[PDB]
């Protein structure tokens, strides 16, 4: 037999389920070591629309942070836990978008816009400012934190009888639970006006609308309750129905063929998912909002596929706005386009985000310095240095060069 040498064979409590995932996804919104910035004002109900506030940093109210936190508006990749109080930079792009939401909700119209930009320019956070203006002005915010959770086939899905659509019960349930906490104040003032026959429970007309949402205790009847809720919020002629802000982050995920498989093992299109089929209809104008509001779709660059149809549409809409007689056209021999993506994006408005101005960059640096997190003399010579290293004022890059450095 073999005589060679062989190494003969031969601690702590392990984490609980979901503990690891919750570690890399928790959001810290304070730092006791950070200094309280003197003169830091809080956002009034009408501060994200004043032209004079451009370039100034203001703190978010306490109740707003509870609502924004409820619907997962903050993200771990963002630098919030470095300062004491969550504050945002009122930006010239914020006043533009907000002034439209203000007029839209007042005139009963609906703005259907798409936000675009570079890797980290403030797309995801420009929505956080749109939702902030919505909560403070008594709107109904329906936010979808990550659009990749609806397309990457990571949640339960079931078909609808006699239709090509597909529902996602486990996600729709979780979506209602977070919809209550965020809009608890606005919903408390509204009651039902229609007779919903099929529901997990009996609900008479003229009852607390918040009761209708509490019927969805199981994932099965989750979608049915949602459609009923959607009918109430969009009551044609009912006093007290506020505008609706239907926002979605990661637009590039719902503009392609999803990863789900139908019984024939054929990829399901993202626009067939009942929940995604609702946002695209509101974004395309097919489904009208009688009370008005805004439908905002923000793209993303971190973990985002490329859809030539969306990129072409965004390019065509910007060309028509500029007035160019010639508009980008399809590549007559490319097979990466999607007719349905073109139809949805055929009338939306584009909002390109780029680096901030040197005046806004100062207001953001002074806030970091006042908090003791940037030990430098904030002057024109220092603002232009950070403004240059950040690639013409890209807010995302300006943080890595000032806050996430190893020099202080």
């Amino acid at each position: 037999q073999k005589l060679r040498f062989k190494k003969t064979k031969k601690s702590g409590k392990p984490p609980l389920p979901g503990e690891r995932k919750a570690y890399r996804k928790k959001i810290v919104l304070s730092n006791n070591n950070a200094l309280p910035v003197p003169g830091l004002e809080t956002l009034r109900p009408n501060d994200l629309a004043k032209q004079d506030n451009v370039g100034s940093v203001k703190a978010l109210p306490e109740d707003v942070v509870d609502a924004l936190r409820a619907m997962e508006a903050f993200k771990p990749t963002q630098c919030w836990g470095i300062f004491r109080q969550p504050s945002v930079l009122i930006r010239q792009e914020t006043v533009d978008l907000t002034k439209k939401m203000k007029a839209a909700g007042a005139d009963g119209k609906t703005i259907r816009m798409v936000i675009e930009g570079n890797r980290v320019t403030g797309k995801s956070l420009l929505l956080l400012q749109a939702m902030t203006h919505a909560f403070m002005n008594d709107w109904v915010v329906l936010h979808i934190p990550e659009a990749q959770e609806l397309t990457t086939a990571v949640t339960e899905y079931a078909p609808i009888e006699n239709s090509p659509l597909w529902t996602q019960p486990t996600y729709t349930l979780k979506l209602l639970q977070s919809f209550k906490r965020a809009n608890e104040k606005v919903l408390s003032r509204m009651n039902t006006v229609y007779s919903h026959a099929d529901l997990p429970q009996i609900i008479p007309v003229n009852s607390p609308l918040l009761q209708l949402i509490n019927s969805a205790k199981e994932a099965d009847g989750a979608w049915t309750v949602f459609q009923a809720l959607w009918r109430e919020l969009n009551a044609e002629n009912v006093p007290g129905r506020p505008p609706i802000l239907f926002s979605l982050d990661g637009l590039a995920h719902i503009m392609k063929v999803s990863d789900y498989r139908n019984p024939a093992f054929e990829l399901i299109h993202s626009h067939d998912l009942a929940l995604v089929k609702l946002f695209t209809d509101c974004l395309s104008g097919a489904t009208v909002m009688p009370n008005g509001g805004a439908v905002l779709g923000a793209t993303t660059r971190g973990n985002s596929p490329r859809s030539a149809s969306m990129e072409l549409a965004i390019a065509q809409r910007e060309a028509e706005k500029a007035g160019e007689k010639e508009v980008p056209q399809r590549d007559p021999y490319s097979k990466k386009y999607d007719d349905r993506v073109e139809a949805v994006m055929k009338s939306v408005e584009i909002l390109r985000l780029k680096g901030v101005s040197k005046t806004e960059a100062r207001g953001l640096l002074e806030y970091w310095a006042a908090s003791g997190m940037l030990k430098k003399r904030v002057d024109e010579s220092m603002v232009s240095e950070k403004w240059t290293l950040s690639g013409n004022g890209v807010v995302g890059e300006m943080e890595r060069a000032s806050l996430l450095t190893m020099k202080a």
Binding site: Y23, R24, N33, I82, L404, M406, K407
Partner: protein, 223 residues
């Protein structure tokens, strides 16, 4: 007292030359916006832009020439120390003299790291002479070590304790936060590296007489 250009620099004490409003004459003075005062601060040399301790400790995290990763880890460590509560110094483990109070370390994460490394770093090293203590045994003799050797030994002990600890969470901050927590345990005196520091110091005191041993002075003088 409204300020205007004709009186801005006069009333604000700012140099118009530094701002380029009234530049100098290049054909005569050679410059256009003033000359930097020499000698320059050490931090302005692109090879010495980071602190000596931070730059030295960063490259000890590096593996396989991945300096960009180690630089982001050191940035996460200094960010963790900056968000942690002030430490509670232990009188049994006196830090290096002259350090700032514990209340100042959080806002100064670089000093937080420096005070930690310079506090557990040993002051001596044990060198052995082959076959001079008896029947084939070596003669261990202590000797002092420069700063870079003190910090290198210290931070390598910290990384040795870190690698052996179990995993806690997920993401890109696992290793960074795991190291930062050990940096805090050192300043609070409840770390394991303090034992390794005292263990090597005992060998020095237990062998302080070997500096003049008969074997070390009779190598080839007993023909």
């Amino acid at each position: 007292v409204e300020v205007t250009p004709e009186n801005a620099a006069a009333l604000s004490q700012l140099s118009e030359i530094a701002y380029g409003v009234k530049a100098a004459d290049v054909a005569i003075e050679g410059h256009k916006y003033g000359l930097p005062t020499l000698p320059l601060p050490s931090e302005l040399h692109h090879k010495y832009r980071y602190s000596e301790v931070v730059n030295h400790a960063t490259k000890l995290l590096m593996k396989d020439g991945k300096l960009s990763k180690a630089q982001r880890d050191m940035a996460m460590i200094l960010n963790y120390l900056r968000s942690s509560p002030p430490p509670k110094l232990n009188p049994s483990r006196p830090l290096i003299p002259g350090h700032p109070p514990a209340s100042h370390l959080p806002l100064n994460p670089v000093e937080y790291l420096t005070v930690a490394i310079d506090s557990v770093a040993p002051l001596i090293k044990m060198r052995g002479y082959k076959g001079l203590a008896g029947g084939g045994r070596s003669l261990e003799v202590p000797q002092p070590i420069p700063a870079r050797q003190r910090r290198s030994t210290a931070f390598k002990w910290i990384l040795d304790v870190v690698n052996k600890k179990p995993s806690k969470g997920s993401g890109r901050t696992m290793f960074a936060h795991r190291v930062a927590e050990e940096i805090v345990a050192v300043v609070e005196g409840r770390s394991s590296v303090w034992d390794k520091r005292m263990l090597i110091h005992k060998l020095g005191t237990a062998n302080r007489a070997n500096l003049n041993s008969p074997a070390l002075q009779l190598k080839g003088k007993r023909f």
